[PDB]
Amino acid sequence: SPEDKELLEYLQQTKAKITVVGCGGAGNNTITRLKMEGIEGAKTVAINTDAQQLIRTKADKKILIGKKLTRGLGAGGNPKIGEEAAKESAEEIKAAIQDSDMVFITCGLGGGTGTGSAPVVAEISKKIGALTVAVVTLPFVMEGKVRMKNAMEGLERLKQHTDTLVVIPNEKLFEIVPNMPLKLAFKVADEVLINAVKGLVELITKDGLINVDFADVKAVMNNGGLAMIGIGESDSEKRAKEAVSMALNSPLLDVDIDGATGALIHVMGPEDLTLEEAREVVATVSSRLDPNATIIWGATIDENLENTVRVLLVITGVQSRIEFTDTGLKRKKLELT
Amino acid sequence: SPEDKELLEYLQQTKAKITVVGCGGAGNNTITRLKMEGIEGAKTVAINTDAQQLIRTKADKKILIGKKLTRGLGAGGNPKIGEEAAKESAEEIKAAIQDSDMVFITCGLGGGTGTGSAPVVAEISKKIGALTVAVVTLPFVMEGKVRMKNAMEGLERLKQHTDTLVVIPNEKLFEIVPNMPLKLAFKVADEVLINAVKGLVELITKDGLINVDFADVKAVMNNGGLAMIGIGESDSEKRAKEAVSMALNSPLLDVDIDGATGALIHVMGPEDLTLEEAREVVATVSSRLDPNATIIWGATIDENLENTVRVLLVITGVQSRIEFTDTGLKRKKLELT
Amino acid sequence: SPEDKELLEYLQQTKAKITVVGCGGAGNNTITRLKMEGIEGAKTVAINTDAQQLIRTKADKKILIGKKLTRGLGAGGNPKIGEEAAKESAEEIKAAIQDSDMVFITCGLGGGTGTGSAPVVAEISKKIGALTVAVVTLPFVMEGKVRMKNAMEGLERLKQHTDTLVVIPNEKLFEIVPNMPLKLAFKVADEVLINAVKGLVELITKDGLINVDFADVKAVMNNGGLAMIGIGESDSEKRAKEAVSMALNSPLLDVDIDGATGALIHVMGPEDLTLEEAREVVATVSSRLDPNATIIWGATIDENLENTVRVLLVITGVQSRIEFTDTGLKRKKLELT
Numbered sequence A, B, C: 001s002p003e004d005k006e007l008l009e010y011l012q013q014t015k016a017k018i019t020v021v022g023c024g025g026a027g028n029n030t031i032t033r034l035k036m037e038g039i040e041g042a043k044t045v046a047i048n049t050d051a052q053q054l055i056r057t058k059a060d061k062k063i064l065i066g067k068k069l070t071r072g073l074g075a076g077g078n079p080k081i082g083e084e085a086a087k088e089s090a091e092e093i094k095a096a097i098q099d100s101d102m103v104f105i106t107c108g109l110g111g112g113t114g115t116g117s118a119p120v121v122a123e124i125s126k127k128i129g130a131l132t133v134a135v136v137t138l139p140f141v142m143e144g145k146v147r148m149k150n151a152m153e154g155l156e157r158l159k160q161h162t163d164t165l166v167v168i169p170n171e172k173l174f175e176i177v178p179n180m181p182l183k184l185a186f187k188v189a190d191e192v193l194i195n196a197v198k199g200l201v202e203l204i205t206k207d208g209l210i211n212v213d214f215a216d217v218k219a220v221m222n223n224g225g226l227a228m229i230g231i232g233e234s235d236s237e238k239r240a241k242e243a244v245s246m247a248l249n250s251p252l253l254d255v256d257i258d259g260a261t262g263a264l265i266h267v268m269g270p271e272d273l274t275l276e277e278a279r280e281v282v283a284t285v286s287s288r289l290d291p292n293a294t295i296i297w298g299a300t301i302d303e304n305l306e307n308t309v310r311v312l313l314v315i316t317g318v319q320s321r322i323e324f325t326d327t328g329l330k331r332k333k334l335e336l337t
């Protein structure tokens, strides 16, 4: 019987179905790259209020939101417009992510479409039962006050409809490469975004030297709250030891992590990668967190790495350690006795 | 014109469209029986969080709920899981009962899928405009405290989204057959459930010796509140007189009925059944209720009955006469002056 | 690519998509006329609780609402029934107006289907993002108190889910034609309704001597609040001057308009119509409103007019100038110092 056969097949499902949704200009640009470079077992959805930007984007599925409100002509940097446009097209957004076990929402906060629509996409995602994760950036300071204030209000709004919320503050990118021009600024930020999003997705979906169980992934991210990342990599031969230390000292991981529970670790490298190096990585990280933190990790081989091991660290539950101001994220300053 | 022809046809509709929805293990088992034995003009919908149980079930329509939450692997006796799973699949549940004039929701309360999903199915049913009736059982006491507390909380939740709520307390079954083994326990309870559900459905949908008008059915059940049943039957020749007295004295009808408004009576028997016997039944019952109670009744002939008349009594509006405790239903004890 | 081609085509869209929805007897009758006489670029949707009335109606789309509640047998003058019936069929109502840039909701308030369902249709319309305008009538006084009280409560309910709400009080029709019989009463009211609805639609959708931009239409009506109309026309040769004065003195425009912002003006006439006459019309009206009022206007040629110019005035934002009583609309009486 068709129904019964359908029920049996479901039980044989082997991999988690993942969907990546990019909103606004920056988000569509991230999506275009993932589609071209490829992103192991994950469909791509692009959404915009701006028709031209959507046309030049490459993705499995495109949705023009706010057709009646904006008219395919952008949201002009206004968050409230991006939000009403998304609410207006909620039905189409929902049908595009309906069968997903997990949904990644990515965009650069600061403008009108991404900042306004991301929280709406996340709310629809949770309503349908998918693990809902966001990977977004805060704007550079040179972009100015209005852009940051809008980004911060959007981060707040997004926190409420998200399982784990991963924030990358673009301004820290200058601490990685001090004298960089705005030209290459958004090029570096692009790189970081792809590594974070692709690193998390592959950790969950790419066959490695140890199996990572989606049910564990879900248990840790279900209450990931606010999260931050760290990226490091070594070319030497004492690789692991150096990549992890670099990742842990990354300016991107701008928060006190000793009180963290949960964390996801993805160690990448060449054919000669060993569970031994991965383990050294995990334990070095494992000691800086809470003694009872849950850690999810994996290890994958990447041809293009040639002779390097890259380490991606996502540390969760740090919201209590951060302060959300109109001007950005500031490491919290706890009150004396 | 296709539209106009469609509108005319609707006016020619003759019978109420009924749907029976069974949730969880016990509910699916009840559905499997109804489908095989047949149930005059009513489609069958089975829903479960457990794939295996759904596979071995027989029904017109099957829905695996909570696919992302539980993974076709049951709800493990947790009501909150059954509830989120149902909310997660609300769209599919709705489309399955969308065109129903009336919806019957049946399950055994106590576990996780039925207790949690029944109130959700009932809420969707009312939202679409269907007469919403539930026929459920409370667990035996030997099953223990946790199972009863969960059943009671579910009954409460279900009361709020239901037109009339029919409760069968399995523990009373021992007063019918005193020394019975757990083996046959759930076999007796199965029998009772089928007679209640099939008795109500046929009363509404089976051609009898008097026509029962769906609009009257709807008027009485629209405010049936909490309801209880009674079953009796006579083999003698003073049949009617005995079946009704047995039904009225049934341990299943564990409440003071003198203050009841509304009631549904279904008298069943062989080819020799007469409107005379039905009427004696009705009047004997009619005198124990409120002097202004509304009674809906019918009379049908059943080949398999050979030489017996069976009487099904459903007495509504008794909630004020019952006390809902964590440990079960207790006849209420009104406060003195 | 199909998606991309689809996105490009959207950018080439030239006209606003308009839908007219008539509810109840009077509304269906208005719809039947619009469909036959034709109504430049606007689809017609008819909805009723009464099957017979829906059958004899002519429209692009018909929807029988409340199929489970009422059974194609009307709502018997009860607003609460009309409302539950509409809520019950919300999904079908929504799909019928889903792709509309603008939605006009018309009916005669006073009975059960129109009064109850109009606010529901308007709420669905706003939810999807369409400009939501209502054009409705208040009953004659000879119809009695109950009919007016129900009409007034419906107007109140409708105000909350509408962008601009246009009210035509049928009782004023006697000031236009003093000694008129009930026979011709509803015939005159029919005429007025068609001119108001068709006048507004054509102003937005009919090619004229000056282009009216939908975006301006939307900006003015977005906050039109309560609106009233005025109709005038001249056969002479000092046409414009007379039509506008007649329109401005119309008993239909029963409110103090000096404090009005926004207004829509549609001047119609024969082949010899000139932007000069239209302009005289606009300026004569423009001086009675607030010095900063926004006015939207157009001018169209109608063959059937032969030698007359007709003027349609819709003046918005007058709610503060009106008093909503159980017995009707009364020009407000501001409180002294």
Ligand SMILES: Nc1nc2c(ncn2[C@@H]2O[C@H](COP(=O)(O)CP(=O)(O)OP(=O)(O)O)[C@@H](O)[C@H]2O)c(=O)[nH]1
Pocket: A023, A024, A025, A026, A027, A029, A049, A050, A074, A075, A076, A077, A078, A107, A108, A109, A110, A111, A112, A113, A114, A115, A138, A139, A140, A143, A147, A170, A186, A187, A189, A190, A193
């Ligand atoms: N990594 C990148 N970040 C970018 C890029 N362009 C902008 N951004 C970041 O995102 C912010 C603005 O993003 P978008 O241009 O995508 C704004 P959006 O399209 O969502 O709003 P509207 O233009 O109003 O439609 C800006 O403040 C930057 O911090 C880019 O090419 N790469």
Ligand SMILES: Nc1nc2c(ncn2[C@@H]2O[C@H](COP(=O)(O)CP(=O)(O)OP(=O)(O)O)[C@@H](O)[C@H]2O)c(=O)[nH]1
Pocket: B023, B024, B025, B026, B027, B029, B049, B050, B074, B075, B076, B077, B078, B107, B108, B109, B110, B111, B112, B113, B114, B115, B138, B139, B140, B143, B147, B170, B186, B187, B189, B190, B193
């Ligand atoms: N009449 C019957 N009642 C049953 C039967 N099995 C269980 N029950 C009653 O229902 C209660 C448990 O029912 P189910 O096994 O259907 C619980 P459910 O499937 O809804 O929850 P999960 O296992 O967590 O998925 C139990 O407390 C009993 O009182 C049966 O075969 N027949």
Ligand SMILES: Nc1nc2c(ncn2[C@@H]2O[C@H](COP(=O)(O)CP(=O)(O)OP(=O)(O)O)[C@@H](O)[C@H]2O)c(=O)[nH]1
Pocket: C023, C024, C025, C026, C027, C029, C049, C050, C074, C075, C076, C077, C078, C107, C108, C109, C110, C111, C112, C113, C114, C115, C138, C139, C140, C143, C147, C170, C186, C187, C189, C190, C193
């Ligand atoms: N312009 C017209 N107005 C009408 C006409 N018939 C009624 N009406 C007005 O509308 C009011 C009643 O309208 P309907 O007959 O359409 C009431 P409806 O169908 O919505 O309610 P139910 O009969 O309960 O289904 C009445 O109080 C009148 O003021 C008509 O032919 N033309």
Ligand SMILES: [Mg+2]
Pocket: A024, A025, A050, A053, A074, A075, A111, A113
């Ligand atoms: Mg943009």
Ligand SMILES: [Mg+2]
Pocket: B024, B025, B050, B053, B074, B075, B111, B113
């Ligand atoms: Mg089970």
Ligand SMILES: [Mg+2]
Pocket: C024, C025, C050, C053, C074, C075, C111, C113
């Ligand atoms: Mg009618």
